[PDB]
Amino acid sequence: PIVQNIQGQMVHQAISPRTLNAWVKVVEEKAFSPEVIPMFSALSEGATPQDLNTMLNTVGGHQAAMQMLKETINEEAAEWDRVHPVHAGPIAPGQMREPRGSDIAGTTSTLQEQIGWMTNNPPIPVGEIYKRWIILGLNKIVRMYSPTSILDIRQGPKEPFRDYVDRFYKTLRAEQASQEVKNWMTETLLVQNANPDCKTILKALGPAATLEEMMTACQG
Amino acid sequence: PIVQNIQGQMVHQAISPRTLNAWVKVVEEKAFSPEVIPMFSALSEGATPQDLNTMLNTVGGHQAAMQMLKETINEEAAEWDRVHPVHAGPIAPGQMREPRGSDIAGTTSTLQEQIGWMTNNPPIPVGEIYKRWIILGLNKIVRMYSPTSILDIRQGPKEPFRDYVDRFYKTLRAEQASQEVKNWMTETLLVQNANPDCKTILKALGPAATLEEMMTACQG
Amino acid sequence: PIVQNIQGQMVHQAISPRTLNAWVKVVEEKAFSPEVIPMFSALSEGATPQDLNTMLNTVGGHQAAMQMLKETINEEAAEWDRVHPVHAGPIAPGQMREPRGSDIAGTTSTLQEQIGWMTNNPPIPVGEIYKRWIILGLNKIVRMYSPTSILDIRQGPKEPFRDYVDRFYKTLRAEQASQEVKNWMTETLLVQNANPDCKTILKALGPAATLEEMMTACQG
Amino acid sequence: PIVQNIQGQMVHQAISPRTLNAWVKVVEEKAFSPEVIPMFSALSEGATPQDLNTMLNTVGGHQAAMQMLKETINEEAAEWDRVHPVHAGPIAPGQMREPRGSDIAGTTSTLQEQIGWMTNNPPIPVGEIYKRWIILGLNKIVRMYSPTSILDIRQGPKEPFRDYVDRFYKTLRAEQASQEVKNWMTETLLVQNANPDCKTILKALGPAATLEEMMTACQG
Amino acid sequence: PIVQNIQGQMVHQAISPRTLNAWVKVVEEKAFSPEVIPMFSALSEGATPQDLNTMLNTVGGHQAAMQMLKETINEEAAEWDRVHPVHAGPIAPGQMREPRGSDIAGTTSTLQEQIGWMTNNPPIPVGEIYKRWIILGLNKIVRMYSPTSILDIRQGPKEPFRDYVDRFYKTLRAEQASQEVKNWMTETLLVQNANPDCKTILKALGPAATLEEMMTACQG
Amino acid sequence: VNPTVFFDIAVDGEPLGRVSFELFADKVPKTAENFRALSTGEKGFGYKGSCFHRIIPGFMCQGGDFTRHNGTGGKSIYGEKFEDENFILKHTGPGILSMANAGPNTNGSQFFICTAKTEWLDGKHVVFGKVKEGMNIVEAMERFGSRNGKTSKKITIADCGQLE
């Protein structure tokens, strides 16, 4: 990835082996958790499309998920070309390159072309666009890897409220929906699926009670 | 490997022990799977032919694969020498003599000569050529390690569709016969070998079905 | 080692603690496998005889192998001193004296004399000769650690051809025979020592047998 | 169909009856086989869209195949209208307006307009476009009339190799999935489905074997 | 095929449907026999490569033979390329470029280019070269279609000399060998394989007896 | 923005003059990058020390066969041959730099510099640059060629590189 170099002139610095090893280890140890998306977004800050292609090729296993990621990248490139076609217009006095769906995906774009598109003024946000595409793909993958539906989350007879709410919020974060749907679900589904012993306790507190009040109520 | 300085010029740098350790560890732990070529290309960016001969000789075990790689490099060097004969006689003062195939390999040349080739005007990319040759050899090696053929894939009555498609795409990436042949295979062989119940669930969606709906059909 | 400063004079630098730790770790972890010689030649690059003596002394254990290596270095120094006369008397300024065998071994010299002999015009590869001697010694050591001979390798009835050729090439790499004799061995004994089934398979394959087609024929 | 004269110009000519008779006879006698497309392309060289609509409507029987061809022509005409949109504004004096997707078929245009389109300056090849569409439709028809898939081919214990390879190449030319995939199939599926005795006779020659030696091996 | 047109100016005349029907009939009844090569050479006199491709595509069935013919055409094209290299560069306005190895087979050469290569002065014999290639292929195919070898031809006890000599000469013509070898083959095989009584009858005439005397010997 | 490369021409080793070219990378980018990179020699192989093997007075000067030196070879920086990028620019006059080929989609490294308007070549050879400085050096070169192209003296690209 390119980085601000002293003084004020961005030059290309190849991806460090330690970053690739950290990525391989986090994909090996954590599989495909919701948190990987932030770890991926933070490990590849300002990365050229070639670096993101390297980081997606260095993965070991989960080839089905990588295939969905590649297909969604292709779909985003296709839609991007459809949303950004060259309509006839007077030619600009200044010419700057332009990134195609295939030029953004780093397939047919040489490293020099990407460095140009990034360091030129005005900059072309090819890296951020490809990162948005990969993040959409990773969201698809992590929502697919969900073992059970959020509607099936129910507490055991003696399962403490601690582990119950932990697992429930984990599955809810892995689940995909708008924020208002989650706001309705945390009020309609959480208290209902609790164990009756502590369900009575949560009902005694009130419907619009916060999480900490219920948690300290059923505490112990 | 060469590294640029503050003023922009580059000079030889000793190979880091961390790179060698990571390469040997990933070769030992991940054996010879499709995800060694991206990591190899990322580890040795800008490495001299001596550094690549180091990274290859340092691989203990799997000596048959290393011999295959050596034979492939030998054939590529012979073809390069046949397609680019070297001239004889005195060499110009402002130009250094062009390398032969055995010297592009870095077998019979000093490190200073490699650095002079890589930092010449214009620069000569011996490192990139030898890296391309090593990548081709590694592709042939990962082709050889392929456990099963693409046609023998048939899902068991109990083996889940996720594991089936994982194995399929694993051996498909390990096949690397071509790109359009791979595209035809993922359309035909993927749906041709499903378990009868989920098979007809996929046929209910027709050939226009994508992989995501293909999986969520048999899901749950 | 002696790192060459960018566009400047080559500056001496002490061996890195990271380099020495990696060296002692690989020694302790892998004992004396055939790849320790390539990894040693990789870690020690452009190093003075003082650096090489330090890298040898940091090794703990295997004192028999260390004494054999020191005896090999002594024999090489004796041969060098016998086939190279040593001059004496007053020496002209700006020109270092004749390096003796005990000095090229680093046992009777100092870092100043080593750097002087490595910076002279024309340079005298004291480091490259002492490293050659150390590699000869390490070759003797790895030959001594060879558990079984090469002529006594026989494939098991159930042991597959891949494992058989792996062991065969490991023992071949450990073998001490010259490269010209080394070729005939891998041409003949490989197919002459295998199990009868794939032996007849490779016999039907006939001449020009290469490892790739051999392994593709002995499949299943 | 148009025909050149002594002066070099061309003009419409009435369709010959023993062409219609030959086409109807070859369509009925040979029904649908891969060798109906070359005969169709040879019979109607330079034929106007009216002549092609004649040659298609004249085919009595197999009305399902003719409806498939009509549907394929229908979809092809729609694509042509979508790909190119008529320009607005004043038209040049030396040029006049073009036909539509449906008029390429000749469904809603008189013969004189077809002749003017074909002999204009520059000439417009409506006949060749509609012939390409009809050839694609006939390819789809002969695909449907294929009696098996390419994978189900397995030679019987008594069925000679000649009949096996004949059936294989027949359904392969009737497949027309691609050209490079065909090249991979003729290497893999041809060698993978032989009778065990002749199978190992073919394996005795390796993958470098050509078809001639492939058959003369099992011959006699 | 092009034909001399009044007066003295060759113009392109498309292949007539009656010629194609005659070819389909002779490849329907005669199938593959020695007489097909002469019939093919007479039906396609002075034919452009497109006409020969049309005549080779219209054959229904016998796909193995057509594939052999295509592969031998490719082999002859490769040999022509290896013997007649084609230099790249801009063409002269008056003369046409030298046809490549694949421009002869009508694969990538448009009809206009072939017409140019034929009508130009001096003419390029593309048609005769492609005819020689197709004739080599047809000779291969008719020598393959031979049911038995010439050494296996033997007369029955009461099978008349007429049928025996007819079948023997038919198999000898279908067989492929130099005429000089046939001169010994006839004098060694014709009399020996005959019936014992007719054998003595022919031996009474002499070794160098002509065919008509040998016939009228055992006549009736 | 558009690269400029030069060629120092030599006739049997006597220096003759410098021709410099503006490559139209804004319309034919892949064609222009291949001539630029072969001129710098940055990919390891190139034009320096190759000669014009075919010079036809009043038509064009052709060169660029650095592998076989006679019009049968040369290779691109993308492999031995690549597609015809496009045909936006036409052969309008002297100084136009156009790609030689052996029919469509066969571009390698051979190029030709026109010394006349050659409209018949339009649509058949990709144009990707024009002489900037040095056209009288291209004109003087014509004298060492012939009707059939054969040149009388060896005409070499003594040195070449990028200027801007």
Side-chain angles (χ1 to χ4, degrees), chain B residues 129-164:
Chain B
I129 294 170
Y130 194 67
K131 187 183 307 178
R132 289 160 178 172
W133 295 358
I134 294 177
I135 286 182
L136 195 142
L138 287 163
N139 285 283
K140 289 190 177 179
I141 291 164
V142 70
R143 278 185 174 184
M144 185 200 70
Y145 270 94
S146 315
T148 79
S149 159
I150 186 61
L151 56 90
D152 263 348
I153 300 170
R154 284 171 191 179
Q155 186 168 352
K158 192 45 193 93
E159 188 176 14
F161 184 76
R162 172 62 81 98
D163 301 4
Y164 162 81

Coordinates of all heavy atoms in Angstrom, one line a residue, chain B residues 129-164:
Chain B
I129 N 11.6 -12.2 -13.9 CA 11.6 -13.3 -14.8 C 11.7 -14.6 -14.0 O 11.0 -15.6 -14.2 CB 12.7 -13.2 -15.9 CG1 12.4 -12.0 -16.8 CG2 12.8 -14.5 -16.7 CD1 13.5 -11.6 -17.7
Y130 N 12.7 -14.7 -13.1 CA 12.9 -15.9 -12.4 C 11.7 -16.2 -11.4 O 11.4 -17.3 -11.2 CB 14.2 -15.8 -11.6 CG 14.7 -17.2 -11.1 CD1 15.1 -18.2 -11.9 CD2 14.8 -17.4 -9.7 CE1 15.5 -19.4 -11.4 CE2 15.3 -18.6 -9.2 CZ 15.6 -19.6 -10.0 OH 16.1 -20.8 -9.5
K131 N 11.1 -15.1 -10.9 CA 9.9 -15.3 -10.1 C 8.8 -15.8 -10.9 O 8.0 -16.7 -10.4 CB 9.5 -14.0 -9.5 CG 8.4 -14.1 -8.5 CD 8.0 -12.7 -7.9 CE 9.2 -12.0 -7.4 NZ 8.8 -10.6 -6.9
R132 N 8.6 -15.4 -12.2 CA 7.6 -16.0 -13.0 C 7.8 -17.4 -13.3 O 6.9 -18.3 -13.3 CB 7.5 -15.2 -14.4 CG 7.0 -13.8 -14.3 CD 7.4 -12.9 -15.5 NE 6.8 -11.6 -15.4 CZ 7.2 -10.6 -16.2 NH1 8.1 -10.8 -17.2 NH2 6.6 -9.4 -16.1
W133 N 9.1 -17.8 -13.5 CA 9.4 -19.2 -13.7 C 9.1 -20.0 -12.5 O 8.6 -21.1 -12.6 CB 10.9 -19.3 -14.1 CG 11.3 -18.7 -15.4 CD1 10.4 -18.1 -16.3 CD2 12.6 -18.7 -16.0 NE1 11.1 -17.7 -17.4 CE2 12.4 -18.0 -17.2 CE3 13.8 -19.1 -15.6 CZ2 13.5 -17.8 -18.1 CZ3 14.9 -18.9 -16.5 CH2 14.7 -18.2 -17.7
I134 N 9.5 -19.5 -11.3 CA 9.2 -20.2 -10.1 C 7.7 -20.4 -9.8 O 7.2 -21.4 -9.3 CB 9.9 -19.6 -8.9 CG1 11.4 -19.6 -9.0 CG2 9.5 -20.2 -7.6 CD1 12.1 -18.9 -7.9
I135 N 6.9 -19.3 -10.2 CA 5.5 -19.4 -10.0 C 4.9 -20.4 -11.0 O 4.0 -21.2 -10.6 CB 4.9 -18.0 -10.3 CG1 5.1 -17.1 -9.1 CG2 3.4 -18.1 -10.5 CD1 4.5 -15.7 -9.2
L136 N 5.4 -20.5 -12.2 CA 4.9 -21.6 -13.1 C 5.3 -23.0 -12.5 O 4.5 -23.9 -12.6 CB 5.6 -21.4 -14.5 CG 4.9 -22.2 -15.6 CD1 4.9 -21.3 -16.9 CD2 5.7 -23.5 -15.9
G137 N 6.5 -23.1 -12.0 CA 6.9 -24.4 -11.4 C 6.0 -24.7 -10.2 O 5.6 -25.9 -10.0
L138 N 5.6 -23.7 -9.4 CA 4.8 -24.0 -8.2 C 3.3 -24.3 -8.7 O 2.7 -25.1 -8.0 CB 4.8 -22.8 -7.3 CG 6.0 -22.6 -6.5 CD1 6.1 -21.1 -5.9 CD2 6.1 -23.6 -5.3
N139 N 2.9 -23.7 -9.8 CA 1.6 -24.1 -10.4 C 1.6 -25.6 -10.8 O 0.7 -26.3 -10.5 CB 1.3 -23.2 -11.5 CG 0.8 -21.8 -11.1 OD1 -0.3 -21.6 -10.6 ND2 1.7 -20.9 -11.2
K140 N 2.7 -26.0 -11.5 CA 2.8 -27.4 -11.8 C 2.8 -28.3 -10.6 O 2.3 -29.4 -10.6 CB 4.0 -27.6 -12.7 CG 3.9 -27.1 -14.1 CD 5.0 -27.5 -15.0 CE 4.7 -27.0 -16.5 NZ 5.8 -27.5 -17.4
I141 N 3.5 -27.9 -9.5 CA 3.6 -28.7 -8.3 C 2.2 -28.8 -7.6 O 1.9 -29.9 -7.2 CB 4.6 -28.0 -7.3 CG1 6.1 -28.2 -7.9 CG2 4.5 -28.7 -6.0 CD1 7.1 -27.3 -7.2
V142 N 1.5 -27.7 -7.5 CA 0.2 -27.8 -6.9 C -0.8 -28.5 -7.8 O -1.8 -29.1 -7.3 CB -0.3 -26.4 -6.6 CG1 -0.7 -25.6 -7.8 CG2 -1.5 -26.5 -5.6
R143 N -0.5 -28.6 -9.1 CA -1.3 -29.5 -10.0 C -1.0 -30.9 -9.7 O -1.9 -31.8 -9.6 CB -0.9 -29.2 -11.5 CG -1.7 -28.0 -12.1 CD -1.4 -27.9 -13.6 NE -2.2 -26.9 -14.2 CZ -2.1 -26.6 -15.5 NH1 -1.3 -27.3 -16.3 NH2 -2.9 -25.7 -16.1
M144 N 0.3 -31.2 -9.4 CA 0.7 -32.6 -9.1 C 0.1 -33.1 -7.8 O -0.4 -34.2 -7.6 CB 2.2 -32.8 -9.1 CG 2.6 -34.2 -8.9 SD 4.3 -34.3 -8.3 CE 4.2 -33.7 -6.6
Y145 N 0.1 -32.2 -6.8 CA -0.4 -32.6 -5.4 C -2.0 -32.8 -5.4 O -2.5 -33.3 -4.4 CB 0.0 -31.6 -4.4 CG 1.3 -31.9 -3.7 CD1 2.5 -31.4 -4.2 CD2 1.4 -32.8 -2.6 CE1 3.7 -31.7 -3.6 CE2 2.6 -33.1 -2.1 CZ 3.8 -32.5 -2.5 OH 5.0 -32.8 -2.0
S146 N -2.6 -32.4 -6.5 CA -4.1 -32.5 -6.5 C -4.5 -33.9 -6.2 O -4.1 -34.8 -6.9 CB -4.6 -32.1 -7.9 OG -4.0 -30.9 -8.4
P147 N -5.3 -34.1 -5.1 CA -5.6 -35.5 -4.7 C -6.5 -36.2 -5.7 O -6.2 -37.4 -6.0 CB -6.3 -35.3 -3.3 CG -5.9 -33.9 -2.9 CD -5.8 -33.1 -4.2
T148 N -7.6 -35.6 -6.1 CA -8.6 -36.3 -6.9 C -8.8 -35.5 -8.2 O -8.5 -34.3 -8.3 CB -9.9 -36.5 -6.2 OG1 -10.7 -35.3 -6.2 CG2 -9.6 -37.0 -4.8
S149 N -9.4 -36.1 -9.2 CA -9.8 -35.4 -10.4 C -11.1 -34.7 -10.3 O -11.8 -34.9 -9.3 CB -9.9 -36.4 -11.6 OG -10.7 -35.9 -12.6
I150 N -11.4 -33.8 -11.2 CA -12.6 -33.0 -11.1 C -13.8 -33.8 -11.5 O -14.9 -33.5 -10.9 CB -12.4 -31.8 -12.1 CG1 -13.6 -30.8 -11.9 CG2 -12.3 -32.2 -13.5 CD1 -13.7 -30.3 -10.5
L151 N -13.7 -34.8 -12.3 CA -14.9 -35.6 -12.7 C -15.4 -36.6 -11.7 O -16.6 -36.9 -11.6 CB -14.6 -36.3 -14.0 CG -13.4 -37.3 -14.1 CD1 -13.8 -38.7 -13.7 CD2 -12.7 -37.2 -15.5
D152 N -14.5 -37.1 -10.8 CA -14.8 -38.1 -9.8 C -15.6 -37.6 -8.7 O -16.0 -38.3 -7.7 CB -13.6 -38.8 -9.3 CG -13.3 -40.1 -10.1 OD1 -14.2 -40.6 -10.8 OD2 -12.2 -40.6 -9.9
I153 N -16.0 -36.3 -8.7 CA -16.7 -35.7 -7.5 C -18.2 -36.1 -7.5 O -18.9 -35.9 -8.5 CB -16.6 -34.2 -7.5 CG1 -15.1 -33.8 -7.5 CG2 -17.4 -33.6 -6.4 CD1 -14.9 -32.3 -7.7
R154 N -18.6 -36.8 -6.5 CA -20.0 -37.2 -6.3 C -20.3 -37.1 -4.8 O -19.6 -37.6 -4.0 CB -20.2 -38.6 -6.8 CG -20.3 -38.7 -8.3 CD -20.4 -40.2 -8.8 NE -20.2 -40.3 -10.2 CZ -20.1 -41.4 -10.9 NH1 -20.3 -42.6 -10.2 NH2 -20.0 -41.4 -12.2
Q155 N -21.4 -36.3 -4.5 CA -21.7 -36.1 -3.1 C -22.4 -37.3 -2.5 O -23.2 -38.0 -3.1 CB -22.7 -34.9 -3.0 CG -23.0 -34.5 -1.6 CD -23.8 -33.2 -1.5 OE1 -23.9 -32.5 -2.5 NE2 -24.2 -32.8 -0.3
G156 N -22.0 -37.6 -1.3 CA -22.5 -38.7 -0.5 C -23.9 -38.4 0.0 O -24.4 -37.3 0.0
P157 N -24.7 -39.5 0.4 CA -26.0 -39.2 0.9 C -26.1 -38.4 2.1 O -27.1 -37.7 2.3 CB -26.6 -40.7 1.1 CG -25.7 -41.5 0.3 CD -24.3 -40.9 0.3
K158 N -25.1 -38.4 2.9 CA -25.1 -37.6 4.2 C -24.1 -36.4 4.1 O -24.3 -35.5 4.9 CB -24.7 -38.5 5.4 CG -24.9 -37.9 6.7 CD -26.3 -37.2 6.8 CE -26.4 -36.3 8.1 NZ -26.0 -34.9 7.8
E159 N -23.1 -36.4 3.3 CA -22.2 -35.3 3.2 C -22.9 -34.0 2.8 O -23.6 -33.9 1.8 CB -21.1 -35.6 2.1 CG -20.0 -34.6 2.1 CD -18.9 -34.9 1.2 OE1 -19.1 -35.8 0.3 OE2 -17.8 -34.3 1.2
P160 N -22.8 -33.0 3.7 CA -23.6 -31.8 3.4 C -23.2 -31.1 2.2 O -22.1 -31.3 1.7 CB -23.3 -30.9 4.7 CG -22.9 -31.9 5.7 CD -22.1 -32.9 5.0
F161 N -24.1 -30.3 1.6 CA -23.8 -29.5 0.4 C -22.6 -28.6 0.6 O -21.9 -28.3 -0.4 CB -25.0 -28.8 -0.1 CG -24.9 -28.1 -1.4 CD1 -24.9 -28.8 -2.6 CD2 -24.7 -26.7 -1.5 CE1 -24.7 -28.2 -3.8 CE2 -24.5 -26.1 -2.7 CZ -24.5 -26.8 -3.9
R162 N -22.5 -28.0 1.8 CA -21.4 -27.1 2.0 C -20.0 -27.8 1.9 O -19.1 -27.3 1.2 CB -21.5 -26.5 3.4 CG -20.3 -25.7 3.8 CD -20.1 -24.5 2.9 NE -21.0 -23.4 3.2 CZ -20.7 -22.3 4.0 NH1 -19.4 -22.2 4.4 NH2 -21.5 -21.3 4.2
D163 N -19.9 -29.0 2.5 CA -18.6 -29.7 2.3 C -18.4 -30.2 0.9 O -17.3 -30.2 0.4 CB -18.6 -30.9 3.2 CG -18.8 -30.5 4.7 OD1 -18.9 -29.3 5.0 OD2 -18.7 -31.4 5.6
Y164 N -19.5 -30.5 0.2 CA -19.4 -30.9 -1.2 C -18.8 -29.8 -2.1 O -17.9 -30.0 -2.8 CB -20.8 -31.4 -1.7 CG -20.9 -31.4 -3.2 CD1 -20.4 -32.5 -4.0 CD2 -21.5 -30.4 -3.9 CE1 -20.5 -32.5 -5.4 CE2 -21.6 -30.4 -5.3 CZ -21.1 -31.4 -6.0 OH -21.2 -31.4 -7.4

